Each structure stands twice: as structure tokens, then as C-alpha cells.
Ligand SMILES: C[C@]12CC[C@H](O)C[C@H]1CC[C@@H]1[C@@H]2CC[C@]2(C)[C@@H](c3ccc(=O)oc3)C[C@H]3O[C@]132
């Protein structure tokens with residue numbers, strides 16, 4: 001059985017879908033992964049997957065595709081949509097001349113209009129949600145008009161205004177982003193399969209509520225591996241020199257960027273903490289680091305790298321905590337790895353994830369802005385996690401969640417059962 005997979009063109013959307021594809025390929029399915037040309041330019045390793053990669057045009061002007069969208073999200077997301085509709089149609093028409101014929105298209109939930117392409121081509125459509133049910137519920141309420149972006153929503157903790165998904169940070173892209181998030185639920189009744197990268201035990205009540213509206217399949221964590229350059233050997237050799245529970249892993253993901261002034265705060269907090277640290281600073285961001293930071297002043301205790309093998313880093317026993325922007329993949333990967341967090345959310349669902357991390361799952365602490373987070377606050381959070389009694393509690397809580405995540409993906413577990421149900425439905 002031949003499955004097509006079409007992620008939104010960004011690493012937090014590609015990666016969780018890739019991991020689901022790898023699990024499906026392990027069960028005997030053929031996989032074709034559909035990527036934009038801009039994504040393929042960053043792809044360095046794919047021979048070992050056995051998954052076929054088929055590219056489509058970016059469909060918006062070239063100058064990554066994402067940094068073009070941000071220039072004008074309202075227009076360029078719509079141009080991306082129209083081009084993706086045309087070019088995935090053309091690609092599927094071609095794939096229908098080859099055996100095995102495609103049967104289902106799994107697409108990122110942010111691209112609901114791909115359902116119409118799947119159905120027009122005679123395929124089943126599966127919408128793949130890359131954020132948890134608790135945060136997706138807010139987008140559903142946004143579509144319903146129940147909330148426009150203290151706040152009480154069914155089966156969610158009481159939220160402050162600050163805990164709602166942050167779109168005001170995007171300035172003139174705010175309304176376009178709020179619309180795209182809400183439109184994930186615009187055709188949910190017509191989707192053949194609704195897949196969420198979460199597991200039931202993590203959010204029992206909101207998953208139960210969602211399931212009373214639509215049949216949903218919680219299949220997460222989909223993560224068990226890399227398409228992009230991860231500097232694996234350099235990172236893993238450095239971590240192998242570190243003793244247990246001594247390393248702060250620091251990463252703000254694939255998209256977020258911090259100001260030069262904020263970078264200085266983080267640099268100084270890491271140095272004066274006197275902890276070992278592995279800090280992912282993307283290539284296009286390292287110019288904002290203090291002058292001799294990468295080459296000299298970080299060499300005694302730190303490794304500054306443009307990308308790491310994050311699953312392998314979070315699995316390493318030297319890692320004591322994860323200073324994170326709280327993107328959903330990073331949050332879930334840290335929880336499933338038993339790694340407590342220091343929450344520094346930037347925008348979109350990161351704000352809500354940071355609330356869930358700190359107050360519901362209780363595996364992290366959050367920083368306080370002054371709107372710059374200062375070194376002393378970061379140092380204070382580091383001391384709380386690394387040294388204080390509260391930090392031992394967060395570590396114990398993270399280990400309990402690791403165990404529940406292990407149950408979910410093992411035989412008889414909720415996510416294993418749901419992937420089996422999906423897999424059998426196709427057979
Ligand atoms: C505006 C922008 C800011 C960061 C950077 O400069 C890029 C900007 C343009 C893209 C934007 C990004 C913010 C986060 C997104 C909305 C995110 C997404 C997409 C679909 C979805 O369902 O959920 C979340 C991933 C990426 O599409 C984002």
C-alpha cells in the first residue's frame with residue numbers, strides 16, 4: 001500500500017511527519033514524501049530512508065520558502081496554496097501511472113485544502129496535526145468564533161491572556177496567521193482520518209472531548225531519523241565527554257530568532273552558570289552572538305553548533321535540562337526523553353505549551369521578561385532546575401511522563417493501537 005505524505009514546508013512540520021512515515025514504512029507501506037524545492041535544497045541524507053522524495057515547486061518567489069512567506073503571509077500563503085494545489089495534482093496524476101498506486105495522502109493539518117486534492121484524485125485524506133489536542137482545541141474555538149486572538153475553555157486549565165497562542169508578535173502577519181490556525185478545523189467533518197501527534201495519557205479529558213465530536217487517532221510521539229545536516233558526530237562526541245546530568249541543552253528551534261541583545265543575555269547566563277551547555281545557534285543567526293563567543297569564550301564549557309541531532313541529544317544522560325522555545329516537537333521530545341525544561345516561549349503555540357509544561361505536566365519552569373529576559377532570571381531558572389529541590393521534582397515528573405510515553409508507543413499502548421487501527425483500515 002502506497003502512502004503519500006505532504007508536510008508544511010518547515011522543520012517542525014516535516015520532522016514529525018517523517019517519523020510517522022518511518023513507522024509506517026516499517027510496517028511494509030511504500031511512502032512518497034512530497035517536499036518543496038526549497039526544502040530539498042537543505043536535504044543532505046535520504047538514501048538510508050528508502051522513502052521516495054518527490055519535489056514540487058515552492059510556488060512563491062525565491063530569494064528558504066518560509067522567509068519569503070513572512071514578507072507577506074496573507075498573500076504568500078495563498079499563493080503557496082494555489083501552487084501546491086496545482087502541483088500536487090500534477091504529481092499525483094503522474095504517480096497514478098506507476099504501481100503501487102497511491103491510496104492515501106497524509107497532509108499537514110495547516111493545509112486543509114489538500115483534502116479536496118486527495119478526494120478529487122480518488123485518495124483517502126488524513127489530516128496530521130503537529131500540535132497537541134489541548135492547543136488544537138483553541139484553534140477550533142477560534143474557528144467557531146468562541147474566542148478571538150482570564151480565559152476558560154472546556155477541559156483546559158484556566159489560562160491567562162499571556163498563555164493564549166501568540167499572534168500579535170507577528171505584527172502585520174497577525175491576522176493571516178490567526179486565520180490559518182483556525183482553518184485547520186474548516187473541513188474536519190470531511191476528513192477520512194484525523195491524526196494527532198500526542199498520546200492520550202498526556203491530555204485525557206480534551207482528547208475524550210475531541211473524540212465525542214470526531215473519530216480521532218492519537219499516534220504520538222511519532223518520533224522514535226534526520227534529513228538535514230545534524231553535525232551528529234561532533235555533538236555526540238562532545239556529549240560523551242560530559243558526566244550525567246551536567247549539560248544544559250539550549251535551542252530555539254528552526255524558525256524563532258532572538259535579538260542581538262537577547263542573545264547577549266543568554267550567552268552571559270550560560271557562562272556565569274558555569275554549567276556545560278550545548279547551544280544550537282542556526283547559521284544565519286550566529287552573527288548576533290557576542291564577538292568571541294563561538295570561537296573562544298564558549299570553548300571551556302560549551303558547544304555552539306548550527307544544528308544537532310535533537311533526538312539523540314535529549315536521549316543522552318549528560319543532559320540535565322532543556323532551555324527551549326517550547327515548540328511542540330521540542331516539548332514532546334523532551335517529555336518522552338525525561339528531560340525537564342526551562343521555558344522561553346516566543347510566539348504561536350509556544351506560549352500555551354509553556355503553560356502546560358509548567359502548570360499541568362509540571363516538568364519545567366518559565367522565565368519572566370522585564371521585554372528582555374535577563375541573565376539573572378535565566379541563571380535563576382538554571383539553579384532551580386539543576387540544583388534546587390524543585391528541580392528534582394521536575395526531573396521525577398519528567399521521568400513519569402517518559403514512562404507513560406513509552407507505554408503509549410509500545411504494544412497494547414494507545415498510540416500503538418491507533419497506528420495499528422489506521423494501518424489496518426488501509427489494508
Ligand atoms: C510568521 C512566521 C514567524 C517566524 C518566521 O519568521 C516565519 C514566519 C512565516 C511562517 C510562519 C511563522 C510563525 C509560525 C508559523 C505560523 C508555523 C505554523 C504553520 C502552520 C500551522 O498550522 O501552525 C504553525 C510555521 C510557519 O508558518 C509559520
Ligand SMILES: O=c1ccn([C@@H]2O[C@H](COP(=O)(O)OP(=O)(O)O)[C@@H](O)[C@H]2O)c(=O)[nH]1
Pocket residue numbers: 010011012013015016230251252253254255256280306307308309310311326327328329330331333
Ligand atoms: O538542533 C536541532 C534543533 C531542532 N531540531 C528538530 O527540529 C524540530 C523543531 O520543531 P519544534 O516544534 O520544536 O519548533 P519549530 O522549529 O517548529 O519552531 C524538532 O523536530 C527538533 O527535533 C533538530 O533536529 N536539531
